[PDB]
Every structure is written in C-alpha cells, then in structure tokens.
Design a protein around this nucleic acid. Structure first.
Ligand SMILES: [Mg+2]
Ligand SMILES: [Mg+2]
Ligand SMILES: [Mg+2]
Ligand SMILES: [Mg+2]
Ligand SMILES: [Mg+2]
Ligand SMILES: [Mg+2]
Ligand SMILES: [Mg+2]
Ligand SMILES: [Mg+2]
Ligand SMILES: [Mg+2]
Ligand SMILES: [Mg+2]
Ligand SMILES: [Mg+2]
Ligand SMILES: [Mg+2]
Ligand SMILES: [Mg+2]
Ligand SMILES: [Mg+2]
Ligand SMILES: [Mg+2]
Ligand SMILES: [Mg+2]
Ligand SMILES: [Mg+2]
Ligand SMILES: [Mg+2]
Ligand SMILES: [Mg+2]
Ligand SMILES: [Mg+2]
Ligand SMILES: [Mg+2]
Ligand SMILES: [Mg+2]
Ligand SMILES: [Mg+2]
Ligand SMILES: [Mg+2]
Ligand SMILES: [Mg+2]
Ligand SMILES: [Mg+2]
Ligand SMILES: [Mg+2]
Ligand SMILES: [Mg+2]
Ligand SMILES: [Mg+2]
Ligand SMILES: [Mg+2]
Ligand SMILES: [Mg+2]
Ligand SMILES: [Mg+2]
Ligand SMILES: [Mg+2]
Ligand SMILES: [Mg+2]
Ligand SMILES: [Mg+2]
Ligand SMILES: [Mg+2]
Ligand SMILES: [Mg+2]
Ligand SMILES: [Mg+2]
Ligand SMILES: [Mg+2]
Ligand SMILES: [Mg+2]
Ligand SMILES: [Mg+2]
Ligand SMILES: [Mg+2]
Ligand SMILES: [Mg+2]
Ligand SMILES: [Mg+2]
Ligand SMILES: [Mg+2]
Ligand SMILES: [Mg+2]
Ligand SMILES: [Mg+2]
Ligand SMILES: [Mg+2]
Ligand SMILES: [Mg+2]
Ligand SMILES: [Mg+2]
Ligand SMILES: [Mg+2]
Ligand SMILES: [Mg+2]
Ligand SMILES: [Mg+2]
Ligand SMILES: [Mg+2]
Ligand SMILES: [Mg+2]
Ligand SMILES: [Mg+2]
Ligand SMILES: [Mg+2]
Ligand SMILES: [Mg+2]
Ligand SMILES: [Mg+2]
Ligand SMILES: [Mg+2]
Ligand SMILES: [Mg+2]
Ligand SMILES: [Mg+2]
Ligand SMILES: [Mg+2]
Ligand SMILES: [Mg+2]
Ligand SMILES: [Mg+2]
Ligand SMILES: [Mg+2]
Ligand SMILES: [Mg+2]
Ligand SMILES: [Mg+2]
Ligand SMILES: [Mg+2]
Ligand SMILES: [Mg+2]
Ligand SMILES: [Mg+2]
Ligand SMILES: [Mg+2]
Ligand SMILES: [Mg+2]
Ligand SMILES: [Mg+2]
Ligand SMILES: [Mg+2]
Ligand SMILES: [Mg+2]
Ligand SMILES: [Mg+2]
Ligand SMILES: [Mg+2]
Ligand SMILES: [Mg+2]
Ligand SMILES: [Mg+2]
Ligand SMILES: [Mg+2]
Ligand SMILES: [Mg+2]
Ligand SMILES: [Mg+2]
Ligand SMILES: [Mg+2]
Ligand SMILES: [Mg+2]
Ligand SMILES: [Mg+2]
Ligand SMILES: [Mg+2]
Ligand SMILES: [Mg+2]
Ligand SMILES: [Mg+2]
Ligand SMILES: [Mg+2]
Ligand SMILES: [Mg+2]
Ligand SMILES: [Mg+2]
Ligand SMILES: [Mg+2]
Ligand SMILES: [Mg+2]
Ligand SMILES: [Mg+2]
Ligand SMILES: [Mg+2]
Ligand SMILES: [Mg+2]
Ligand SMILES: [Mg+2]
Ligand SMILES: [Mg+2]
Ligand SMILES: [Mg+2]
Ligand SMILES: [Mg+2]
Ligand SMILES: [Mg+2]
Ligand SMILES: [Mg+2]
Ligand SMILES: [Mg+2]
Ligand SMILES: [Mg+2]
Ligand SMILES: [Mg+2]
Ligand SMILES: [Mg+2]
Ligand SMILES: [Mg+2]
Ligand SMILES: [Mg+2]
Ligand SMILES: [Mg+2]
Ligand SMILES: [Mg+2]
Ligand SMILES: [Mg+2]
Ligand SMILES: [Mg+2]
Ligand SMILES: [Mg+2]
Ligand SMILES: [Mg+2]
Ligand SMILES: [Mg+2]
Ligand SMILES: [Mg+2]
Ligand SMILES: [Mg+2]
Ligand SMILES: [Mg+2]
Ligand SMILES: [Mg+2]
Ligand SMILES: [Mg+2]
Lengths: 44, 272
RNA sequence: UUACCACGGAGUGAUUCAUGACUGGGGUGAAGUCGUAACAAGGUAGCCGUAGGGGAACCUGCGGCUGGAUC
RNA sequence: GAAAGACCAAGGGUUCCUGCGCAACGUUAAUCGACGCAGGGUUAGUCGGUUCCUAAGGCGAGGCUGAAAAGCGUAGUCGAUGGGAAACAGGUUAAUAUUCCUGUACUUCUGGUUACUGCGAUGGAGGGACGGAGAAGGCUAGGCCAGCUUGGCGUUGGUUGUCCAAGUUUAAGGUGGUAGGCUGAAAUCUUAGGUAAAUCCGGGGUUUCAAGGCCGAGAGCUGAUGACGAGUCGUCUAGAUGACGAAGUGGUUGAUGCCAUGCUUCCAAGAAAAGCUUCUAAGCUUCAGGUAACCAGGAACCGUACCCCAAACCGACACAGGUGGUCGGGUAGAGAAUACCAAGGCGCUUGAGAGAACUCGGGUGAAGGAACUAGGCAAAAUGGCACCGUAACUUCGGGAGAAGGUGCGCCGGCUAGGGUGAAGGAUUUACUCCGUAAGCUCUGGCUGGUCGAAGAUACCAGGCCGCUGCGACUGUUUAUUAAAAACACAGCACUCUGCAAACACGAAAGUGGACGUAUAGGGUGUGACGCCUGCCCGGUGCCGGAAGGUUAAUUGAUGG
RNA sequence: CUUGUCGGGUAAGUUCCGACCUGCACGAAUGGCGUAACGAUGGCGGCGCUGUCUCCACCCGAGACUCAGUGAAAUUGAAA
RNA sequence: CAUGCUUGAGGUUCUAACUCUGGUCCGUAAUCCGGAUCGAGGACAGUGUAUGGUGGGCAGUUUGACUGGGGCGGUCUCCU
C-alpha cells in the first residue's frame, strides 16, 4: 500500500527550506518564532 | 466531401468525416509558426474561470495575416493548408517579392489566383479593399471594426456578411447572426465567403472524439447536491423545482445579458 | 478380422396439419338508437389520388375528370 | 531462475572490509550478525553533476494597481523530467575501479613559430527540430550444429568409437562509402522582400548538362607476431607464486536491438532556445582579427564504499504490503504464458515428538443427481489446432468460437516444394550480377505398420442454450461494507453573446474565454437509432409596449 | 385491495411468460413506445456436471495435544 | 403681441474635457508602461457620493407549552 510520505530532497527544500521561508513575511515570522523558542533545527 | 464510415465497430457507426483531398499534406511553412501552450481554463490566479476545457492534441499557432496591408503588390496562392486552431482553411500566399503569408482562404481559391488588395483592386473573390469602394449588395467576410486593427467579424467556416446600405462616413451590413450593424467606411473587408462550408455536416461519433479537441465532460446540475448547484437535491429524479438557472444564480431561459451602453449607437437593430 | 449395410441413437433446422387465453375486420338477421352522406343544381356538383381532422355517414387543403344542372 | 539472478535512478548514510567480543539488540541458543569496541576503505579531460541553452512555472529594476502588508507584470534571469565535446579491452585489493596499472584511442583549449589573408553582433538567414499506426526488407548481438585441441576408457550387460567431457574468446578506434533514404545541377543578369546593410536567404529572366550533392547500419581489412586461454613445469606454504601454455575454424538460425529523426498512410495536424554554418552594421586597416602547418603544455571543482523491487527506501517491527527504468540463456511452446533446468542465488532466526475431537488447505468416493438453498453459493464440468457444419433476429457490420461433430502418439515406404550456398557464365573488372553439387534449414502430400484403457496424455487451456426488465454501446463512481438501473457519452433542443462579447477569478490593475469571432463561445435540459412528441399563457418566471395611475433622494409655495 | 382473473410452463408455481382493463396513484425531451449489438446488471426456465444434498466415509499436509526455550492480551470491589 | 433678462425639458450639431484591450515615432535591445502625433467616440461612456428596485448569490437567527412516550387532534384568559 502507498503511504502519505514519499521522500524527495529537492521537493523538501523548495517548500520548507530556509530560502523559502525568507521569501515572504509569513515565513519570516515562522523563523523569528522558532528563534524565540530556542529551536536547534530552525529549518527543514 | 462528407464520408460516412461502415459500422464495423460500435464507435464507428455514427462517424461522418469531412475529408478534403486538395489540402496540402506536407509540412506547414516553418517561419510562420510559433508555439502555444494549453491552459485548462485557468487564469493567472490558477483558478478555473472557463470550465469543460482540458487535454487534446499538441498544436502550433499559425500567424495568419488579418490586416492584409500589402496594397498593390500581386500575390499567388501557393497552397491551401489545414489549421488546427481554426474551423476554416488557410492559404499560403506568395507575393511578387518573396514574402509568404497566411490568410483565411476564400471559397473558390485553389492553386493560382492573384488576390490583390487595396484601392483599385478588381471585384474578384479573395481581393481586399476598403468597404466604401465595394458595390452594395455584395457578400463580404473578414470585416474589421477599427482602421488598422485587422479582421474581427465573419472568420469562421462558411461565414459571410452582406453589404446592404451606405450613407455618410459609415456603412451598414447584415451579419450572419441576423443583426444590423453600421461599420466605418474606412475599414476593410474581403470579397466572398469563407471556405469549408461543409464543416457543419460532420458527426463526431464517439465520446473520445470530443476529448481529442480538449473538451471535458459536462455534468448536469440536476445530478448534483444542493451545495453544488441551485438545481441539486431531491429524492429520485427531480426537474430543478425552480426556474432554470446558472451555477452562479443567473437565469438562462431567455434573460438578456447585454449591458454595454457605449456601443449601443452602432446597432441598427438587434438580432431578435 | 476388414468392407458394405437394416433396426436403433444424438444434435440442429425446414415444411405441413390440428388446437390456443385474447383480439381484428366481414356477412347475415327483427317495426331498435343518432344523424341525413348520395340520387333533382339532393339544396356546399359529384367522383379519382393523397394528407390532416372528426360519434358516424363525412369535412377541409392540393392536383385531376365530366361519368355536372340554368345560361 | 521475465527471479527469490544481475544493474541504473530516487531514498538512506558507514549498514562496506578486517581484528577483538556476546551484557543489551536478533521473537529460541549463538562461538554467528545489517549488534558493541578499534582500525581501514571510495583515485576520472571522456561516467554522473557543475559550467552552456531553454519548457511548464517562479522571481522580477523601472512600471501599473491597491487602507497598510501587498497583487500583477516589462526588460531581465532562474528553473530538467529535454537539447548541447570526446574511451575501450585486459590485469589487480580483504574492501575501488570505463577512475589505479598495461595496451590502444578520442575531444577540447592555451602559448609560441612560419606562411597566407578583410576582421567584426545583441542583428538577418539556414540548421538544430521531433505525431499515431502500419509494412517490406538489410544487419547485428545471441543460440544451435559440425570440425579442431586437450583429457578419459568407467564399482553392473556393452563402450577404441557415427563414444564421452571441457574449451573453441577478443573491444573502442582507424580504413572502407555498401543494403538503402533524400535531392536536379551550373553559369550569368537582376531585385516593391528578410525593420538598417548584405557577396547570405527569398523572388524573377536567359543559356548549358543529365549529371552531381548530402545522409547511411553493416561486411571485409586493421587494431591483434598482442591479450585471454584447459593445463604443464619450478619455488614456497592442505594454497599461493614466477615462467610456459594446445585449438582458437566453418555452416545455419536469428531478434521487441540498429539502418529508422527512414518509408507509406491517417487526422486529433504533432516543444523551445543555444551550441553549429553563413551574411553584413557600428569599428579597424597593416598593430586587431582570421585560415592552415609545426612545437610545447593543460583540461579545474563536486560524487564514486554499501543496500537498492529490499532485513539498509515508504509502512512504529529484521512487517506475506508499496516502489520508476535496463538485461534477460536451454528443452518443449505462438509466446516475456507454463513445466523442468543454466549462470547466479537461496532452504524464508524456535525446534523435537505423537498421529484424539475440532478448524484450515487439498485427494478419492457406492446408488442417486439440485431432492440443498433466499439463490446451483461453492465445487464439479468445458477448454488446443485443422476440417466439416451452424438458428431466430439484424442497424447488413453482426449474432458466431452460435449449437454440434471428425482427426491427433511412435516407426517405416514413396514423393512435392522454399531459403542459404562451391564450381561455372557475363563485363559494370570487384563491398557486382546470374547461378550452383554437397551440407544445413523450413513447409507439405498419400500409404502402411505398431503399443497402451486412455496419444491436444503432464503444466497450460471458453460451459452452453431459451424467454424477459433496465441502460444504446467503450468508459466513470462512494481510497476503507453500495460498481449499479447511478455519472459521462455521441446525437437533439431551448436560450444568451457583435468582441473591450456573454461569462468567471480578482477591493483594483489584470487574467481566462481566445492570439478564438455566431458553422464561434457560455448556460440549461434530454441522452445511439426507429416512429413520434397531443391540449392549457389562468399562477410564477422571461420577453415586448408605453398611454394612464401610484412612486426616492431633491426642491421649498403656503400655513402655524 | 392482491397470491386480481384467464392461458402456458411443474406431480404441485405468492416468482416467470402471454393477455384482460376495474390506471388506489402511466403518459409523451424530470421524454412515450420499440429496438440489433453490448453488460463481473435484475427475474425465470433447460442440457451437461457434480459431496450442494440423502449421509457422510477414508486418506494427505498446517494447527490443536506433549516435551525444551522465549513469553502477551482484553478484564478484575473482594470471594470459602 | 415684439423683444430684452433668466431658468425646467427635449432634439440636433461641434471640439476642447474625458475614453480607446486602434496606427506610427521616441525612451529602448521591450506586444508592459509613459510622452508625442494621426484616427475614432464624445460631453455620452465611466468613477465618487446620495437615492428607489431587484437580489437564498451570501450571513445571523427564530420556528411555545401541556400531553398516561413524542407526533396529529384539542387546550391556554374570565363566569355558573
Ligand atoms: Mg519557427
Ligand atoms: Mg460547456
Ligand atoms: Mg482549439
Ligand atoms: Mg453536453
Ligand atoms: Mg451532461
Ligand atoms: Mg447542464
Ligand atoms: Mg443522481
Ligand atoms: Mg446524488
Ligand atoms: Mg465548489
Ligand atoms: Mg442554494
Ligand atoms: Mg435526485
Ligand atoms: Mg419521485
Ligand atoms: Mg423537485
Ligand atoms: Mg357532399
Ligand atoms: Mg361519398
Ligand atoms: Mg344530402
Ligand atoms: Mg351535395
Ligand atoms: Mg345544407
Ligand atoms: Mg387505392
Ligand atoms: Mg379529397
Ligand atoms: Mg375541418
Ligand atoms: Mg378539389
Ligand atoms: Mg381541383
Ligand atoms: Mg544518494
Ligand atoms: Mg532510514
Ligand atoms: Mg559485514
Ligand atoms: Mg570474530
Ligand atoms: Mg550465555
Ligand atoms: Mg537471544
Ligand atoms: Mg560493526
Ligand atoms: Mg519566464
Ligand atoms: Mg511577480
Ligand atoms: Mg518595484
Ligand atoms: Mg539560464
Ligand atoms: Mg537531465
Ligand atoms: Mg564491490
Ligand atoms: Mg590508463
Ligand atoms: Mg564576421
Ligand atoms: Mg535565428
Ligand atoms: Mg523531442
Ligand atoms: Mg512514429
Ligand atoms: Mg552464429
Ligand atoms: Mg583423444
Ligand atoms: Mg559401466
Ligand atoms: Mg562392465
Ligand atoms: Mg576481428
Ligand atoms: Mg570500427
Ligand atoms: Mg546505395
Ligand atoms: Mg567506485
Ligand atoms: Mg559501486
Ligand atoms: Mg540493486
Ligand atoms: Mg532481486
Ligand atoms: Mg522494516
Ligand atoms: Mg525473520
Ligand atoms: Mg515486506
Ligand atoms: Mg526462458
Ligand atoms: Mg502452449
Ligand atoms: Mg514464469
Ligand atoms: Mg547453479
Ligand atoms: Mg513435531
Ligand atoms: Mg493430521
Ligand atoms: Mg477439510
Ligand atoms: Mg474432487
Ligand atoms: Mg484409489
Ligand atoms: Mg457419488
Ligand atoms: Mg475405483
Ligand atoms: Mg457413480
Ligand atoms: Mg445426469
Ligand atoms: Mg428446491
Ligand atoms: Mg427444502
Ligand atoms: Mg460459481
Ligand atoms: Mg475449478
Ligand atoms: Mg443469440
Ligand atoms: Mg466449437
Ligand atoms: Mg448464441
Ligand atoms: Mg488396443
Ligand atoms: Mg414487453
Ligand atoms: Mg419485470
Ligand atoms: Mg451502461
Ligand atoms: Mg476499453
Ligand atoms: Mg479516477
Ligand atoms: Mg476507483
Ligand atoms: Mg467502498
Ligand atoms: Mg462494473
Ligand atoms: Mg465493492
Ligand atoms: Mg455515479
Ligand atoms: Mg448554443
Ligand atoms: Mg437523464
Ligand atoms: Mg430514458
Ligand atoms: Mg399572458
Ligand atoms: Mg404567463
Ligand atoms: Mg415592458
Ligand atoms: Mg402486490
Ligand atoms: Mg398475479
Ligand atoms: Mg396462473
Ligand atoms: Mg424456484
Ligand atoms: Mg410537451
Ligand atoms: Mg413522470
Ligand atoms: Mg418500454
Ligand atoms: Mg463496461
Ligand atoms: Mg439481460
Ligand atoms: Mg425448478
Ligand atoms: Mg511450552
Ligand atoms: Mg481581456
Ligand atoms: Mg502607446
Ligand atoms: Mg480626435
Ligand atoms: Mg456621462
Ligand atoms: Mg452616469
Ligand atoms: Mg455610482
Ligand atoms: Mg451616479
Ligand atoms: Mg439557503
Ligand atoms: Mg440561511
Ligand atoms: Mg430573505
Ligand atoms: Mg446562504
Ligand atoms: Mg450568536
Ligand atoms: Mg438556532
Ligand atoms: Mg421567537
Ligand atoms: Mg413538549
Ligand atoms: Mg400522547
Ligand atoms: Mg402508557
Ligand atoms: Mg399540536
């Protein structure tokens, strides 16, 4: 049976990557929200 | 001509093809071609704005000359071709100095002809000149609405308009729709009728022939739920218990929708 | 033991008789009901072919004939 | 064994190899391990990226629009799943190899020397450059057979021979211009065109000839007196190591691979851009630049271990699930089905007993033969190739493999053809034409004999027929209890829309409709085809009319 | 109402097929009536075939059972 | 009556505001966008504001209680 997660590293970086967040203000709010919490990862 | 097919299969019983042996069967003229990509009925927001569109064959765009502004120079009809994105045929003209062009083929042009354009041209079919020096009562096609804009009206297969009256700086002609309209006399037109008048006798025959042209199936509103259509709902078959209406709430059995008010003075009388 | 072959058997058709719930017209019969279509110019001249309509004879349209009266 | 064998891509990330270990992990034990500790292991001008070019799409200076955030978009520049330079065989490690080594290649750039020269783009032309189906060929890989070389003479009748086993291999590149495909060629004089120019492309006139020109598998030769090769000799520790090393040829068959982006044909009419060739503009012109020959040198950076239809990826698991592409041998067989095997891989990480009921998956069954049951559910049965023969009805295609029947193994006798192909013949005198005995291979015909219970003998492999309802048919649908009579459909009808179209998404700019133009586009109902589709405009809607009644903001006479 | 009545098919037919018309409460593009071919579509009837059944019997593998190893689950106020 | 001065309404016509998803020139290497100029329409169209009509396209809600179960029916205040 096919499952929901079919990995692809190129489609991963283009949707959730660092340069994708920085392109819009709503993604820039996500990054500043994750910096205030102290997240070690900070991006996909 | 029209060719009927033998009922060898269930999908061949009602196919009526329109096949023309005089059409060119080589490759189109390459310099006058450019790519065009499909849309599926989607605008720049990505939303479906016109529905029942999608699929079909891959097509090139033929740059058809709708202005015909090489006045004085004679031309020759090199061949008559097939256009995937018209219902009429097109003709490749070759002027007296190279300069090959595509135009909408008139009914009678096959392989020779001269098809000159401009002031002083004869009254043969396929010639083009301003609508003012065109004898009244004649049949024309490819009428332009603004000077220098190109043909707009009577371009489909078998289409024509009749020149009925002329007075002042305008001229009056009767459209194929039944509508009386006045056009500027400075505008241009072509003499005759558009080719491929037998196109209306075809029969597709099967559901897959419609999909070849990029048309998707149509679902009736009475086959939906109340949340999708105003016609939806009911136990068993129902008949759209309200007055027949569009999916967006507009009445469709006879209610007029023209509200221009800027071009009203150009209508001598409506088609009704 | 082989060949020929009658009876008999299986499958699928054709043709012809009898019969069949129920239905369609036809003919005949009795002081029955409704109308008056034709025969006189029969009171809208009648007939022929065809199409539509009507309880019914019939009516109407189109084309044809005199086997139509007064003049 | 069309995988449970190999190999790419995605994904994973040290799981790879070696030494030491067994607490935990492994559905049992473990000395073993995809487990713990420690070392080691991935070598490129040619492979894949990057670099060059663009598709859908994204972003987008200025710009237009918008309470703000922001939206759309021009120049532009990103974006492969596509286009664009060039390598193959043989050795070698515990672990890498088209990368290291050996041998033989190819591509591209830089710097010097000489000789001869009109150079120059962002721009113009050519080219790149392409659909579905089908059919004749030509060829190759691969497979068989024969010969040759080496070895053998069989625990039991025979086996020195029309015996048995193994091997009989070899690339890129160069040369060759063939089967075959496309196409007329040359000179001269000009020019309403290709935004400017043009010696380039396109158009026109005249003369001469029937010959050129461009593509193109493959054969042969060469690479190759080399590598490889059963095995032999020697040395060392039951194996490695150095040297040596036989034959290595012919005939048939033959692809879904190549010619082939070819040819024929049909409608639904079948990517772009750059690299590449050519032309000139702005500018140089004896400096720059270009074209040949020779010499010297370079080709950077990144990835290369391992799994990869799975115990390493997606499923919480060492989970009967899912996962794109390539190769794919022998005997039967139409076949990539099926059966038994090859190369290669594995026996699926709890076992041992015994032989109760009952459950699961199967085999056979007396006499009946649907009596079972809501219902022939399930099971049983039919099943191939050739030939004979086949009803109502029909839209004349069909129904139809209707129904039903006959033959089929093996060994001889006689006999008919096709393909390939020595020698010969022609002269077009060599990658050529005709044609060949033997050999090999393929397709038949009519005549006997013979064994068994049974010869389409196993695997494989349609049950059929007669009345009716519904839907014309192929198709689609409730991922996970409903596949249908439901949806779609070709056909039919009504209605709207004259183009800055109706309509739809958008506070708007704008976009789709459509680079379409009433034989078109949108909405609605019905649903092939045949015969048809009757009466009602009182209600509600829509269309038309405009006389007369009412009737908004607005105005502000009059009175208080 | 209703398993309406009549005919056929069965030894026997609330289903099936052909009619009648008394249409509770058919009907003409929410189309009417037919229709060859088609359907993992609904109903009925036959031939063949049979463990579907009378009515089960025997046989073969995997569990169940015993021995060794590892080792769950729902549930549970307390139980003589 | 004849005019003068306004001012309600209608028609015609003009260009000069406005509009052009028409042509050609420039910014410019550019189907956007501006500026210039021809052509067309033209005080209309269109937008702001005020106002009448339409408007399940969309929204926030309402739709009683008793009751020998609820629903249907009946009842709900006052007098004997
Ligand atoms: Mg082109
Ligand atoms: Mg549509
Ligand atoms: Mg189209
Ligand atoms: Mg439709
Ligand atoms: Mg539909
Ligand atoms: Mg509809
Ligand atoms: Mg439905
Ligand atoms: Mg529904
Ligand atoms: Mg929706
Ligand atoms: Mg609604
Ligand atoms: Mg319904
Ligand atoms: Mg109903
Ligand atoms: Mg209803
Ligand atoms: Mg009469
Ligand atoms: Mg009579
Ligand atoms: Mg009478
Ligand atoms: Mg009379
Ligand atoms: Mg009378
Ligand atoms: Mg007669
Ligand atoms: Mg008559
Ligand atoms: Mg009448
Ligand atoms: Mg008459
Ligand atoms: Mg008459
Ligand atoms: Mg990887
Ligand atoms: Mg992982
Ligand atoms: Mg290991
Ligand atoms: Mg060890
Ligand atoms: Mg232990
Ligand atoms: Mg253990
Ligand atoms: Mg380890
Ligand atoms: Mg772009
Ligand atoms: Mg943008
Ligand atoms: Mg900006
Ligand atoms: Mg780029
Ligand atoms: Mg790629
Ligand atoms: Mg390895
Ligand atoms: Mg080397
Ligand atoms: Mg140059
Ligand atoms: Mg170019
Ligand atoms: Mg391509
Ligand atoms: Mg093809
Ligand atoms: Mg061979
Ligand atoms: Mg020997
Ligand atoms: Mg022996
Ligand atoms: Mg012996
Ligand atoms: Mg060789
Ligand atoms: Mg070669
Ligand atoms: Mg040739
Ligand atoms: Mg490697
Ligand atoms: Mg590797
Ligand atoms: Mg693998
Ligand atoms: Mg495998
Ligand atoms: Mg797992
Ligand atoms: Mg396991
Ligand atoms: Mg698994
Ligand atoms: Mg095989
Ligand atoms: Mg077979
Ligand atoms: Mg198999
Ligand atoms: Mg093996
Ligand atoms: Mg046991
Ligand atoms: Mg047992
Ligand atoms: Mg059993
Ligand atoms: Mg059995
Ligand atoms: Mg037995
Ligand atoms: Mg029995
Ligand atoms: Mg027996
Ligand atoms: Mg028996
Ligand atoms: Mg029997
Ligand atoms: Mg029974
Ligand atoms: Mg019973
Ligand atoms: Mg069954
Ligand atoms: Mg079976
Ligand atoms: Mg039949
Ligand atoms: Mg048969
Ligand atoms: Mg049949
Ligand atoms: Mg016998
Ligand atoms: Mg019937
Ligand atoms: Mg029925
Ligand atoms: Mg169907
Ligand atoms: Mg199909
Ligand atoms: Mg689907
Ligand atoms: Mg599905
Ligand atoms: Mg379901
Ligand atoms: Mg189905
Ligand atoms: Mg299902
Ligand atoms: Mg459905
Ligand atoms: Mg329409
Ligand atoms: Mg319907
Ligand atoms: Mg129907
Ligand atoms: Mg009325
Ligand atoms: Mg009305
Ligand atoms: Mg009105
Ligand atoms: Mg009943
Ligand atoms: Mg009954
Ligand atoms: Mg009965
Ligand atoms: Mg029964
Ligand atoms: Mg009607
Ligand atoms: Mg109805
Ligand atoms: Mg019917
Ligand atoms: Mg189907
Ligand atoms: Mg049926
Ligand atoms: Mg029975
Ligand atoms: Mg135990
Ligand atoms: Mg637009
Ligand atoms: Mg402009
Ligand atoms: Mg003007
Ligand atoms: Mg206005
Ligand atoms: Mg206004
Ligand atoms: Mg307003
Ligand atoms: Mg206003
Ligand atoms: Mg509502
Ligand atoms: Mg509401
Ligand atoms: Mg309301
Ligand atoms: Mg609503
Ligand atoms: Mg509230
Ligand atoms: Mg509420
Ligand atoms: Mg209330
Ligand atoms: Mg209550
Ligand atoms: Mg009660
Ligand atoms: Mg009670
Ligand atoms: Mg009540």
């Amino acid at each position: 049976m096919k499952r929901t997660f079919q990995p692809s590293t190129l489609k991963r970086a283009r949707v959730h990557g660092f340069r994708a967040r920085m392109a819009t203000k709503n993604g820039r709010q996500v990054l500043s929200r994750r910096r205030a919490k102290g997240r070690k990862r900070l991006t996909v | 001509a029209i060719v009927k097919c033998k009922p060898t299969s269930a999908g061949r019983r009602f196919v009526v093809k329109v096949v023309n042996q005089e059409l060119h069967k080589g490759a189109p003229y390459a310099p006058l071609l450019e790519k065009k990509s499909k849309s599926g009925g989607r605008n720049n927001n990505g939303r479906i704005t016109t529905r029942h569109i999608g699929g079909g064959h891959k097509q090139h765009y033929r740059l058809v000359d709708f202005r015909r502004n090489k006045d004085g120079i004679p031309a020759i009809v090199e061949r008559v071709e097939y256009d995937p994105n018209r219902t009429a045929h097109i003709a490749l003209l070759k002027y007296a100095d190279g300069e090959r062009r595509y135009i909408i083929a008139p009914k009678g042009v096959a392989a020779g002809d001269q098809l000159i354009s401009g002031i002083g041209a004869p009254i043969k079919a396929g010639n083009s000149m301003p609508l003012r020096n065109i004898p009244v009562g004649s049949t024309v096609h490819g009428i332009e609405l603004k000077p220098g804009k190109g043909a707009q009206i009577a371009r489909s297969a078998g289409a024509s308009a009749q020149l009925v009256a002329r007075e002042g700086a305008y001229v009056t002609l009767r459209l194929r729709s039944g509508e009386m309209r006045k056009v500027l006399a400075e505008c241009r037109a072509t003499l005759g009728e558009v080719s491929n008048s037998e196109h209306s006798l075809r029969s597709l025959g099967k559901a897959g022939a419609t999909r070849w042209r990029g048309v998707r199936p149509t679902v009736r509103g009475v086959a939906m739920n109340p949340v999708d259509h105003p016609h939806g709902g009911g136990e068993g078959r129902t008949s759209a218990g309200r007055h027949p209406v569009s999916p967006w709430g507009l009445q469709t059995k006879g209610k007029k929708t023209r509200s221009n008010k800027r071009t009203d003075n150009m209508i001598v009388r409506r088609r009704k």
